[PDB]
Amino acid sequence: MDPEQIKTALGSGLLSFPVTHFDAEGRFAADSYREHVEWLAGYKAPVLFAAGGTGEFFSLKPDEIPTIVAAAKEVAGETAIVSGCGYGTEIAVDIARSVEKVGADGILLLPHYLIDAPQEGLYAHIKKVCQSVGIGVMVYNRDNSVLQADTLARLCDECPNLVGFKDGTGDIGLVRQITAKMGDRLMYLGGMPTAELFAEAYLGAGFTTYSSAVFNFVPGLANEFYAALRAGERATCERILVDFFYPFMAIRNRAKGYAVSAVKAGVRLQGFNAGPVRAPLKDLTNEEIGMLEALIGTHKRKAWSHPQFE
Amino acid sequence: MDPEQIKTALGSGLLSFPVTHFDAEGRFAADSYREHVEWLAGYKAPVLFAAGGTGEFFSLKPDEIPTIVAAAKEVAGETAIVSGCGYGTEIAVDIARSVEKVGADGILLLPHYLIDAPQEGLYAHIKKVCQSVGIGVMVYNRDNSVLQADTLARLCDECPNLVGFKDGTGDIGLVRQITAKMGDRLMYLGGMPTAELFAEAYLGAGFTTYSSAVFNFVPGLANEFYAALRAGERATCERILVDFFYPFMAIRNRAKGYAVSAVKAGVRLQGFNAGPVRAPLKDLTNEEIGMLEALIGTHKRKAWS
Amino acid sequence: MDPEQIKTALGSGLLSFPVTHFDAEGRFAADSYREHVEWLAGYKAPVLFAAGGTGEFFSLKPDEIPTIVAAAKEVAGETAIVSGCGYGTEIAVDIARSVEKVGADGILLLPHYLIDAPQEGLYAHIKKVCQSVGIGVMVYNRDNSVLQADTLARLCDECPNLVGFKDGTGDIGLVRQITAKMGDRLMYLGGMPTAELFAEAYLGAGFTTYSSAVFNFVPGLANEFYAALRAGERATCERILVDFFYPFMAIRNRAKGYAVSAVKAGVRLQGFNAGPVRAPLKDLTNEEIGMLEALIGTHKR
Amino acid sequence: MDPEQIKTALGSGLLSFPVTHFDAEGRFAADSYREHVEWLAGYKAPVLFAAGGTGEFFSLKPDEIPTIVAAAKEVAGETAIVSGCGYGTEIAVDIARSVEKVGADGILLLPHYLIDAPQEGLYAHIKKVCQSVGIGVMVYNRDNSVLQADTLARLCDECPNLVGFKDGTGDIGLVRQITAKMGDRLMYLGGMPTAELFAEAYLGAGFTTYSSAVFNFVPGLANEFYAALRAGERATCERILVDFFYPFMAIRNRAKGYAVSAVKAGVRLQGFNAGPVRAPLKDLTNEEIGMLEALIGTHKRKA
């Protein structure tokens, strides 16, 4: 897929970021992963990000990433598949080329590792990664990699395959500046960990889509929120925030990393055994999982037969 | 007026926070102040906040505050007048009562002083201030006083005159939760230092007005942006952001406190004798004042207007 | 006394900040306060800071501050009394003059209110407060008022009554630069909320005293720690850290503001009628109070 | 060596973290690196950390790290060689084993990548890395990996080869708690980016050594500061702070990442071909190089 085609797909709907399934031994479990991705496919997200943050990119060995991407591509159907990428330049370029080779439709570039860096350095790093591949690139403003608007403009001028901007800062002042400066040169993607909490505000900032982490386990609910958002049906969005998202946030906020762990637990609850998270994430306790199960409530995909005797 | 009346006014348009004028000795300059406030009133903000943040509340002696509120009220016309209030509970209550006596239409309660406090303590502090007066109260989430939605709900249940919520945190996740919880029980006010940068986003969060600090010196431009915002004319809002506000931010960001200092410099450049800032703010350098003058450009206040 | 004399006293031992006593109605309880301050003076701190942070300065009306300073002065004996001061310049100056009039031996200038300020602005603010009185001044780096070394140097050059520097930032890098720059021009006071946690490190940075908040209710233990610190008995300092201070920190960290509220709870446990904290602080729960009582243990009065 | 031997070496002097030398194309330049490491050897730091932070660990491909370690080992003499290590567990374990294989004497474990993590998660990660090798491990409290004292105690009880603790937080309250709790179970290493600014304070906290990044280009000056520190010669420490370190900081504070870039510039000014930094660091401007040259002054290694 050429960069203008993935750019178009990014603007075509809600974004899917699947958890990466592991077996009990912590190995990638492709059979489980494909089963789950296949189910998600029925809900018609136009872009799937394999091995992104919700997919535990940050705990994968680089040689696992093309394998995960290719597994997703087996069952994605008409969905575009974007790969996570990240770390310092040398590692990032190798990952980018390796996922381009297995047929990724783009890369989502997570921060480099560890250090704070000057704008000129961010520029040089991101430029080198974009020039290493022909597929589309989305940059991700978060943590220790936060592009200013002028730096991003320079990158856009020099790197035609740079077509998306995902925000994880929550900095409205900055992201509205970026959309004012770049206009339709870029597609703007909401990227806060539970993005529906930000989506109505982010419309005003110029963002009409986002990654929905909870789409992993309540896609019907996530799809309805998104449709209501785009239709301006505020009371519908608000009901879903009050009845599902703020209660979810109360679970998510119980421990560091639960923005991922709670999503993975949700997937398990819906009958897909996505397995444990990798350290240094920790899984929800069985009690916490029961809180989430109760919250999912009417949105359950199945019924469980819990073991019981007489 | 009564709380429901200030509540209604707060939702009727763009809000103004006038700078407080000082003479050379640093004393309140009421003639200059009234002259400026009268001019601003011509641009028809339905509420002006006297002695708020932009008005250097944090540098005022408490006996100066009713004097300033009174001076505003003299020449405000129909425009409603809300007073700044703040500090610890004992001082805040004395200020609140003093400004109620000179006819304030409400109070904007800035943070208590210095310390971080538990939600239960914020609740006790704000409740006591609300209960000390009969005029309307707007709370202000910022710095060391950030109410969670459940705490704010409790306050709303027990203090009927609490009618407004101003945000200076920039925390979208929290303010959207607040508007979802409280709905029309409160009026929601955008309160970032240069709030136009946030206004289009804050609409989505449930906020349809804000304080415009730059209204102090380019009220026509501020009014033009507000009109375009409420009308959905995005290309207009964007022009004004790119041409005026991000360049203004570049000036504002040159030093701490310039969110106030640059606004006061703009007022002086437009021919209102606002005087210096009080320490620990500093005034813009002559180079910086020059930058701001050039930026005001075609919006310069002209003798022939 | 004159600024050079409060300077000397500041460097002559352990400092503390008595809690400010309130009745049930939250009004200043002078009788109780004097009873407590008199007991503390018995434990021979050379300087007590009236209406400082531990004394809830941030919740006092400006006209309450000289009343409290005066109460401490009645019973302080050989102890010098320094007054808290703060807010913006206009209020700070009024406070500074009002407590100088009731006999304050110095002022501790807490941060101004609310706003972030540029260094030139801090300089102008602090200079004006210093020049408004003849008694000595200690500046207080914390929160929204943090002086760089060069700004402080300029203040020192222009204000001879500026004689003390208290740190509440915990920024070791910055405070070592300040002591290297100023040398013996200033006395350096450790000012983290529970300062014994920092005292051994601060020695190396050039600070040999600090305010002990817990001196309020275990002055004997606080003195014991201080003596071992200056005598370089590291095993004694470490025992007291492990047995008393980290367990105290565990209680303190349960809620915002407990660096004050827990100390006030300790004072009440020692039989002084210090009363409640003022909002927006909250008092410890009964559970927490019992935790603190259990920790005070053999130090019970 | 075994972990108790590297533990002893950590307590025997100043720690050296050499910059990693690159050619103009950004590739590792082993000949220049060895020239520089050989020169440094004359100043007798007891432990050399190859591909640490100052060595741009965070910009190295994992396959570069053992080559760099082997290069250092060629010329470092009777000196303990510790390798940087980091990232998530899967990557960290492979790096750890690869540098053990080329004869590293220990690993300095930098943070995992990107995420904030719960204490039990940090525990699980660091335990797994420690158990993957037999050589000594030093943990590095900084950024998104900050161990609390109780978590660290649990790791110490379960991993006998965990023998060092390096701090990059600057949190005195915490590091003093950690030294009180663990005592001589661990060697305590100062790790703030220009550590001499912190060293006198950190003594009281229980730390008697640190990484001297500036040892890269003024090792005689760094050695004298260290000697003065351990001797209690406060006026000497202060003179060196005022005349050299605060001026160095003024240069260092001009841009993000200059804690590394300025050190590398200093090495180039002393006549070693250390080359450019890798993005996303940037090199000092010509003006800035000039400021640093002037500062080095009497300490120049050559004309």
Coordinates of C-alpha atoms in Angstrom, one line a residue, chain C residues 61-253:
Chain C
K61 CA -5.0 36.1 58.6
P62 CA -2.2 38.7 58.3
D63 CA -3.5 40.3 61.6
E64 CA -3.2 36.9 63.4
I65 CA 0.5 36.7 62.8
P66 CA 1.7 39.3 65.3
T67 CA -0.6 37.9 68.0
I68 CA 1.1 34.5 67.6
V69 CA 4.6 35.9 67.5
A70 CA 3.8 37.9 70.7
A71 CA 2.5 34.8 72.5
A72 CA 5.7 32.9 71.7
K73 CA 7.9 35.8 72.8
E74 CA 6.3 35.8 76.2
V75 CA 7.6 32.3 77.1
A76 CA 10.6 31.8 74.7
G77 CA 13.2 33.0 77.2
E78 CA 16.7 32.5 75.6
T79 CA 15.1 31.2 72.4
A80 CA 15.0 33.7 69.5
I81 CA 11.6 34.0 67.7
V82 CA 11.4 34.3 63.9
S83 CA 8.1 35.1 62.3
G84 CA 6.6 33.6 59.2
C85 CA 5.9 36.1 56.4
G86 CA 4.6 35.8 52.8
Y87 CA 2.0 36.4 50.2
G88 CA 2.6 39.1 47.6
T89 CA 4.8 42.1 48.3
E90 CA 2.1 44.5 49.6
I91 CA 0.8 42.0 52.2
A92 CA 4.3 40.7 53.0
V93 CA 5.6 44.2 53.8
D94 CA 2.6 44.8 56.1
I95 CA 3.1 41.5 57.9
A96 CA 6.9 42.1 58.2
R97 CA 6.4 45.5 59.8
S98 CA 3.6 44.3 62.1
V99 CA 5.7 41.5 63.6
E100 CA 8.9 43.6 63.9
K101 CA 6.7 45.8 66.1
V102 CA 5.8 43.0 68.5
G103 CA 9.4 42.0 68.8
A104 CA 10.2 39.5 66.1
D105 CA 13.9 38.7 65.9
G106 CA 13.7 37.9 62.2
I107 CA 11.3 37.0 59.4
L108 CA 11.2 33.8 57.3
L109 CA 9.8 34.8 53.9
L110 CA 7.6 32.1 52.4
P111 CA 6.7 32.2 48.7
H112 CA 4.5 34.7 47.3
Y113 CA 1.0 33.7 46.3
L114 CA -0.1 31.6 43.2
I115 CA 2.0 32.8 40.3
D116 CA 5.2 31.7 38.7
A117 CA 7.6 34.6 38.6
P118 CA 10.8 35.5 36.7
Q119 CA 14.1 35.8 38.6
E120 CA 14.1 39.6 38.2
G121 CA 10.6 39.7 39.7
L122 CA 11.6 37.5 42.7
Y123 CA 14.5 39.9 43.2
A124 CA 12.3 42.9 43.2
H125 CA 9.8 41.3 45.6
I126 CA 12.3 40.0 48.1
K127 CA 14.4 43.2 48.0
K128 CA 11.3 45.3 48.9
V129 CA 10.4 43.1 51.9
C130 CA 14.0 43.1 53.2
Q131 CA 14.2 46.9 52.9
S132 CA 10.9 47.3 54.8
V133 CA 12.4 46.2 58.2
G134 CA 15.6 46.3 60.1
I135 CA 15.4 42.8 61.5
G136 CA 17.1 39.8 59.8
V137 CA 15.5 37.9 56.9
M138 CA 15.7 34.3 55.8
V139 CA 14.6 33.5 52.2
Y140 CA 12.9 30.2 51.5
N141 CA 13.4 28.4 48.2
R142 CA 10.3 26.3 47.5
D143 CA 7.4 25.8 45.2
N144 CA 6.9 29.0 43.1
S145 CA 9.8 30.9 44.6
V146 CA 13.1 29.4 43.7
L147 CA 16.1 31.7 43.6
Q148 CA 19.1 30.9 41.4
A149 CA 22.6 31.5 42.9
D150 CA 23.3 34.7 41.0
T151 CA 19.9 36.3 41.9
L152 CA 20.5 35.4 45.6
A153 CA 24.0 36.9 45.3
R154 CA 22.6 40.2 44.1
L155 CA 20.0 40.2 46.9
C156 CA 22.8 39.5 49.4
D157 CA 24.9 42.4 48.0
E158 CA 22.0 44.8 48.3
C159 CA 20.3 43.7 51.5
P160 CA 22.6 43.3 54.5
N161 CA 19.8 42.0 56.7
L162 CA 19.2 39.0 54.4
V163 CA 21.2 36.5 56.5
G164 CA 19.6 33.1 56.0
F165 CA 18.6 30.7 53.2
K166 CA 16.1 27.9 53.8
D167 CA 15.7 25.1 51.2
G168 CA 12.5 23.3 50.7
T169 CA 13.2 22.1 47.1
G170 CA 15.4 19.1 47.8
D171 CA 17.4 20.1 44.7
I172 CA 20.9 19.1 45.9
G173 CA 22.6 20.4 42.7
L174 CA 21.2 23.9 43.2
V175 CA 21.7 24.2 46.9
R176 CA 25.4 23.1 46.7
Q177 CA 25.9 25.8 44.0
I178 CA 24.3 28.4 46.4
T179 CA 26.6 27.5 49.3
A180 CA 29.7 27.5 47.0
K181 CA 28.7 30.9 45.7
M182 CA 27.7 32.7 49.0
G183 CA 29.9 30.9 51.5
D184 CA 29.6 32.3 55.0
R185 CA 27.6 35.3 53.8
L186 CA 24.5 33.2 54.6
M187 CA 23.4 30.6 57.2
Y188 CA 21.9 27.6 55.4
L189 CA 18.8 25.9 56.8
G190 CA 17.5 22.5 55.7
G191 CA 13.8 22.9 55.2
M192 CA 12.3 19.7 53.7
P193 CA 9.0 18.8 55.5
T194 CA 10.6 16.0 57.5
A195 CA 14.1 17.3 57.3
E196 CA 15.9 14.5 59.2
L197 CA 15.5 12.4 56.0
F198 CA 17.8 14.8 54.3
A199 CA 20.1 16.1 57.0
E200 CA 23.1 13.8 56.4
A201 CA 23.1 14.7 52.7
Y202 CA 22.5 18.4 53.4
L203 CA 25.7 18.4 55.6
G204 CA 27.7 17.6 52.6
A205 CA 25.9 20.3 50.6
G206 CA 27.1 22.8 53.3
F207 CA 24.0 22.9 55.7
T208 CA 24.5 22.0 59.4
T209 CA 21.0 22.7 60.7
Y210 CA 17.4 22.3 59.7
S211 CA 14.0 22.7 61.1
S212 CA 12.7 19.6 62.8
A213 CA 8.9 19.6 62.5
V214 CA 8.8 16.5 64.8
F215 CA 10.6 18.4 67.5
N216 CA 7.0 19.7 68.1
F217 CA 6.1 16.4 69.9
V218 CA 9.4 14.4 70.2
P219 CA 11.9 17.1 70.9
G220 CA 14.1 14.6 72.9
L221 CA 14.4 12.2 69.9
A222 CA 14.9 15.1 67.5
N223 CA 17.7 16.4 69.7
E224 CA 19.2 12.9 69.9
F225 CA 19.3 12.7 66.1
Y226 CA 20.7 16.1 65.8
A227 CA 23.5 15.5 68.3
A228 CA 24.5 12.2 66.5
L229 CA 24.4 14.0 63.2
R230 CA 26.9 16.7 64.3
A231 CA 29.0 14.0 66.1
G232 CA 29.1 11.8 63.0
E233 CA 27.5 8.8 64.7
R234 CA 26.0 7.4 61.6
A235 CA 24.8 4.2 63.2
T236 CA 22.7 6.2 65.7
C237 CA 21.2 8.4 62.9
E238 CA 20.4 5.3 60.9
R239 CA 18.7 3.6 63.8
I240 CA 16.4 6.6 64.4
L241 CA 15.7 6.9 60.6
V242 CA 14.7 3.2 60.4
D243 CA 12.8 3.0 63.7
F244 CA 11.2 6.4 63.8
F245 CA 11.4 8.5 60.6
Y246 CA 10.5 6.1 57.8
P247 CA 7.6 4.7 59.9
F248 CA 6.5 8.4 60.4
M249 CA 6.8 9.0 56.7
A250 CA 4.5 6.0 56.1
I251 CA 1.8 7.8 58.1
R252 CA 2.6 11.2 56.6
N253 CA 2.3 9.9 53.1

